[PDB]
Symmetry: C2
Subunit: 60 residues, 2 copies
C-alpha cells in the first residue's frame, strides 16, 4: 500500500497522481492540481491550480 493510493481529491474524492515535475498532486476528476509546499500536500481548492486545457485532455 502506497500513500498515493489512499489520498483522494478534497473536491471530488477522485484519485490523485504525482505531477511530472512532482510539485503537485493532480486531480483530473476535478480539473485541479494541489500544490506540494514545505513538504505538505496543500489540499485546498483555494490553493489549487486549474489544469490547463492540454492537461485535461487525454494523451490517449
Amino acid at each position: 500500500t502506497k500513500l498515493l493510493d489512499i489520498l483522494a481529491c478534497p473536491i471530488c474524492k477522485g484519485p490523485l497522481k504525482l505531477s511530472a515535475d512532482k510539485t503537485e498532486l493532480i486531480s483530473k476528476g476535478a480539473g485541479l492540481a494541489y500544490p506540494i509546499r514545505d513538504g505538505i500536500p496543500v489540499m485546498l481548492e483555494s490553493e489549487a491550480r486549474t489544469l490547463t486545457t492540454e492537461e485535461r485532455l487525454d494523451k490517449l
Copy 2:
C-alpha cells in the same frame, strides 16, 4: 519517485512513514502521527497524536 520521498514533517522536517494500519503519517523526528482523514493527510500538530513510549523507542530486530 514515491510521494513519501517528497513529503516532510511540517514540524521537524524529518521523514514520514505510513503507519501500520495506514491511517497516519508518523513523524518519529517530531514524536507525532498525523491522521489521514477521508483521503487527506491533516498535518498540523494540533490535530496529531503524540507517539507512545513504545513507538518512540528504536525498533529492536534481534533478541537483546
